């Protein structure tokens, strides 16, 4: 599908509310495998299971290993911009 830009708002006491799988060491994108109900990704409305996360706040995630992506994603705070695509 089309590449989308998606805004997510979170406070510092919560996580993003997603589960991710994949990573460059496995030859697969960073993929959203779960959206936790009621948490910030669910509330933002624009992120879905099956989406690949291509970038976050201008940081490219297309070539990142799994744990690299965890560190990058968990560092982001407040108003967070995602670049995502559903295949």
């Amino acid at each position: 599908g089309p590449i989308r830009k998606v805004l997510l708002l979170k406070e510092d006491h919560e996580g993003l509310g997603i589960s991710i799988t994949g990573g460059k060491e496995h030859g697969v994108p960073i993929l959203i495998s779960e959206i936790h109900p009621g948490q910030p990704a669910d509330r933002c409305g624009g992120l879905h299971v099956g989406d690949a996360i291509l970038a976050v706040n201008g940081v490219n995630l297309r070539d990142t290993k799994h744990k690299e992506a965890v560190t990058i994603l968990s560092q982001q705070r407040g108003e967070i911009e995602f670049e995502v695509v559903y295949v």
Binding site: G15, L16, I18, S19, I20, T21, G22, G23, H26, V28, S33, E34, H36, H66, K67, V70, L73, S74
Partner: peptide
């Protein structure tokens, strides 16, 4: 086998 992380 792929890893999964809750974040």
């Amino acid at each position: 086998r792929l890893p999964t992380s809750k974040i």
